[PDB]
Amino acid sequence: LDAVRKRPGMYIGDTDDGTGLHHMVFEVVDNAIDEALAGHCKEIIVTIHADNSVSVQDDGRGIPTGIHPEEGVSAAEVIMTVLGVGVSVVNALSQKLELVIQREGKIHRQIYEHGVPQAPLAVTGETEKTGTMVRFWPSLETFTNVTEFEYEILAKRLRELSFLNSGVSIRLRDKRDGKEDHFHYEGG
Amino acid sequence: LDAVRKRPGMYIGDTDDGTGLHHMVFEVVDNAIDEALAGHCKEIIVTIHADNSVSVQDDGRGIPTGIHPEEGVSAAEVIMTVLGVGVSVVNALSQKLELVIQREGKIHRQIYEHGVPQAPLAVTGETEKTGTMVRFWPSLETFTNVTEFEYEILAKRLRELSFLNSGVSIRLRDKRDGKEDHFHY
Numbered sequence: 001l002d003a004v005r006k007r008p009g010m011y012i013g014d015t016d017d018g019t020g021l022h023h024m025v026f027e028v029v030d031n032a033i034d035e036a037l038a039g040h041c042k043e044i045i046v047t048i049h050a051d052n053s054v055s056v057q058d059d060g061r062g063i064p065t066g067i068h069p070e071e072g073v074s075a076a077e078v079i080m081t082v083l084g085v086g087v088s089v090v091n092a093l094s095q096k097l098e099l100v101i102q103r104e105g106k107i108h109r110q111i112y113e114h115g116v117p118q119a120p121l122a123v124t125g126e127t128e129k130t131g132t133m134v135r136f137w138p139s140l141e142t143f144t145n146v147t148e149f150e151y152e153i154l155a156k157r158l159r160e161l162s163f164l165n166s167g168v169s170i171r172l173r174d175k176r177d178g179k180e181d182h183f184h185y186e187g188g
Numbered sequence: 189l190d191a192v193r194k195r196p197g198m199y200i201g202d203t204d205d206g207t208g209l210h211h212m213v214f215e216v217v218d219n220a221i222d223e224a225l226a227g228h229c230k231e232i233i234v235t236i237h238a239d240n241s242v243s244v245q246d247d248g249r250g251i252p253t254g255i256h257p258e259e260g261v262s263a264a265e266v267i268m269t270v271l272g273v274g275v276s277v278v279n280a281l282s283q284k285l286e287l288v289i290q291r292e293g294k295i296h297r298q299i300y301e302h303g304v305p306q307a308p309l310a311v312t313g314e315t316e317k318t319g320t321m322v323r324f325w326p327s328l329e330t331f332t333n334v335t336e337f338e339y340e341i342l343a344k345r346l347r348e349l350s351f352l353n354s355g356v357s358i359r360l361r362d363k364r365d366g367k368e369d370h371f372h373y
């Protein structure tokens with residue numbers, strides 16, 4: 001990840017005007033849509049939290065959790081820490097990132113700070129559901145001037161995406177003011 | 189450097205009781221002694237600053253500044269960023285690190301934050317002297333409980349090193365309370 005840290009603008013875009021900041025969300029959304037498309041029920045939920053973090057959840061299969069034979073860490077960690085631009089770029093430029101994977105009747109949790117895992121991926125409990133959730137706090141050392149998520153920028157893009165991804169429910173929620181939207185195009 | 193950032197304790201030592209914190213200084217000192225031995229005057233200066241940073245100067249040749257043909261960046265940056273344990277560990281666990289190299293008539297400067305270079309090594313002026321200086325601010329995210337440098341812990345180790353490295357002068361300076369020592373065999 002040090003290559004991304006050396007020159008963040010090359011990977012995420014402009015870190016001052018807000019375009020790079022919102023690209024962080026849209027990169028994570030693209031990965032969530034890919035997981036949602038693998039299934040039948042397909043739903044993703046994008047939540048803007050009151051602390052200016054954004055979470056993106058899908059109800060897909062859940063990212064692989066088993067140890068990678070070469071790397072010697074969970075396959076999830078490899079996805080989050082090895083260099084669309086990839087979620088690893090978002091992780092590198094996030095001062096905090098929470099990963100939650102529900103898979104094979106188990107809840108898996110891991111926390112990152114500036115791309116560095118704080119502990120190995122851990123099974124913390126049980127669940128009937130499946131899916132992947134990433135909640136990230138953009139790094140205020142990288143992202144300057146525009147540091148708060150504009151609802152309209154996310155709402156507009158998610159609406160455009162709904163028409164290209166048939167059968168995928170996309171929910172947008174703003175916990176700051178309680179505003180929300182539901183984009184669900186079932187064409188074809 | 190992310191392997192170091194993942195498990196700092198395994199590389200530097202315990203990050204809560206103050207062992208790791210002081211080992212940061214000792215790792216830098218080892219490299220400063222190597223440079224001091226191969227120069228003329230052979231003196232190192234370890235300064236504890238008021239803002240809880242430590243700087244280690246030597247008056248050696250100055251570490252290489254030219255571009256490394258494999259990595260495509262200054263040889264100094266390769267030393268600071270690629271994995272004695274190495275100063276790259278110290279750089280990785282420092283919230284800020286300032287590198288100053290005097291060599292071939294030129295002063296070179298570079299700043300790091302958590303091991304990430306903020307710009308390439310740059311020529312900032314002219315100079316008659318030679319040597320290398322690293323000033324580092326330990327990351328308070330890594331180093332907890334014992335965050336401030338105890339003078340006697342550094343003094344004890346530098347005394348041991350002065351006997352072992354008989355040709356090298358070792359000066360220790362504390363700017364918080366004005367305390368000083370000069371270890372030389």
Ligand SMILES: O=c1ccc2cc(O)c(O)cc2o1
Nearest residue numbers: 031032056057058087132134
């Ligand atoms: O790299 C990946 C792969 C899948 C994925 C699914 C999510 O729902 C998400 O928020 C982030 C993700 O990142």
Ligand SMILES: O=c1ccc2cc(O)c(O)cc2o1
Nearest residue numbers: 219220244245246275320322
């Ligand atoms: O090769 C190296 C690497 C780090 C380093 C740090 C110092 O403080 C110094 O005086 C000399 C050094 O030489």
Ligand SMILES: Nc1nc2ccccc2[nH]1
Nearest residue numbers: 005113114141301302304
């Ligand atoms: N605050 C902060 N910034 C960082 C950049 C890289 C790795 C760790 C870091 N902690």
